[PDB]
Amino acid sequence: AALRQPQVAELLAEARRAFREEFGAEPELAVSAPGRVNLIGEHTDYNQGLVLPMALELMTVLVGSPRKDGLVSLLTTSEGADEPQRLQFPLPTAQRSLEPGTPRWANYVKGVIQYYPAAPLPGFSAVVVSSVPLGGGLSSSASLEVATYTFLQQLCPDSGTIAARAQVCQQAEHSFAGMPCGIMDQFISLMGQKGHALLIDCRSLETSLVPLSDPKLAVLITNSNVRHSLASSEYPVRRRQCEEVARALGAASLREVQLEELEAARDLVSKEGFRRARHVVGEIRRTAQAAAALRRGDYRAFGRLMVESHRSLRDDYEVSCPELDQLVEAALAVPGVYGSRMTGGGFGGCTVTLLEASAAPHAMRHIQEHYGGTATFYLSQAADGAKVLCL
Numbered sequence: 001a002a003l004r005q006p007q008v009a010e011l012l013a014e015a016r017r018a019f020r021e022e023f024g025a026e027p028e029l030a031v032s033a034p035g036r037v038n039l040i041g042e043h044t045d046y047n048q049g050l051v052l053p054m055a056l057e058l059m060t061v062l063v064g065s066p067r068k069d070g071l072v073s074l075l076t077t078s079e080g081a082d083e084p085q086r087l088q089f090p091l092p093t094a095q096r097s098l099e100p101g102t103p104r105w106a107n108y109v110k111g112v113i114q115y116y117p118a119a120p121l122p123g124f125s126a127v128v129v130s131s132v133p134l135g136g137g138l139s140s141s142a143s144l145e146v147a148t149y150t151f152l153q154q155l156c157p158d159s160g161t162i163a164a165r166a167q168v169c170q171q172a173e174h175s176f177a178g179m180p181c182g183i184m185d186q187f188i189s190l191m192g193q194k195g196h197a198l199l200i201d202c203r204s205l206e207t208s209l210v211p212l213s214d215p216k217l218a219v220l221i222t223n224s225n226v227r228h229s230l231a232s233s234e235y236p237v238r239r240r241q242c243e244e245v246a247r248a249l250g251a252a253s254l255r256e257v258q259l260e261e262l263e264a265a266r267d268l269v270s271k272e273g274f275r276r277a278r279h280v281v282g283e284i285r286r287t288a289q290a291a292a293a294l295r296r297g298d299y300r301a302f303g304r305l306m307v308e309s310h311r312s313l314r315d316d317y318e319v320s321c322p323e324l325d326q327l328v329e330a331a332l333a334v335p336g337v338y339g340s341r342m343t344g345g346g347f348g349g350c351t352v353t354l355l356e357a358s359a360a361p362h363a364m365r366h367i368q369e370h371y372g373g374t375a376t377f378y379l380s381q382a383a384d385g386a387k388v389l390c391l
């Protein structure tokens, strides 16, 4: 009774009803974009490294219709959203551009509109709904950026590439939400495919769809239901730190630096700096092994490289928190768990447990009985990325 089911048919239905009530007519378009769990490859994306996320059945839906008057009218229904629930604004122009501000959920939609590369973009009316827990570490902000972007393509098709769309979504996260994120979360929300993880190369931007078929394997996501102060504050600090271990070692990114190099480079950088790399330069060179291991269906090893990812996130990158540590170390003692680790940016949010489906009922008994805080669970199929339904 801690498991939240996806309920995606009723999420779309909720959004259409709220649209008819709010705007006096039936919406003409539905889009969705998923949130994400990163299986392995944490704090690598901005280090031009490798990540292995998948898309969730947890998503953000826009339902809307173009307007003739050049203005945008938004209703959000998400419980967590900061007041007001509605905002309206003219389209940006050469003269006036959109500005971040109040309410914050709107900043994401504004950013994407502001950086949208095709024209002419008409005004629109839209309802925004999401089953992605807001600020819970499964990329609610990326689902809303990419859901926005997918709605704008229907209003005014772009003639570009999946990376250009991810950079636009990423720029809205930088400029309008003041969060200097990598490309992972936008990329997986765009490109996820049911029954697949997505191995992303954040240097080359090559991507591989890795079958996650086997119905033996389950991915249990557990929300800690915490977010520490340190989150919003330490993420850019870590990023900046990485950029100095890279600058010091005459490497254009840590992708280029290998562990044998960092170990014999100790003197050129700081104890906590060098330790940030043992994680990053290390991390890269085990998502690769996790990738090569999921293909072999090996599981143990992804696991080892996984718990090795948490331990490294906890001790070297210092971006876990006692709640995440107690959840990982808790699951990691249940036989049949290959691995568990913090996922996403850390300082709170979710862990990800690679278990055997048979044991799912007992784990959710156990974790809720053996976790100090409030556990929410998702038993997540690997899902589709951005989608359109004409209405």
Ligand SMILES: O=C1CCCC2=C1C1(CCCCC1)N=C(Nc1nc3ccccc3o1)N2
Residues within 6 Å of the ligand: 060, 076, 078, 080, 081, 082, 104, 105, 128, 129, 130, 134, 135, 139, 140, 141, 144
């Ligand atoms: O306060 C923070 C701290 C940083 C993390 C972050 C938030 C808030 C910002 C706006 C109010 C709720 C919390 N929202 C998101 N993501 C988000 N996804 C959404 C999908 C549909 C509607 C609204 C959505 O807000 N991320």
Ligand SMILES: OC[C@H]1O[C@@H](O)[C@H](O)[C@@H](O)[C@H]1O
Residues within 6 Å of the ligand: 038, 041, 042, 043, 044, 045, 046, 181, 182, 183, 184, 185, 343, 344, 345, 346
């Ligand atoms: O795995 C670490 C990740 O933290 C995310 O939440 C951020 O949006 C990503 O770009 C990546 O930096």
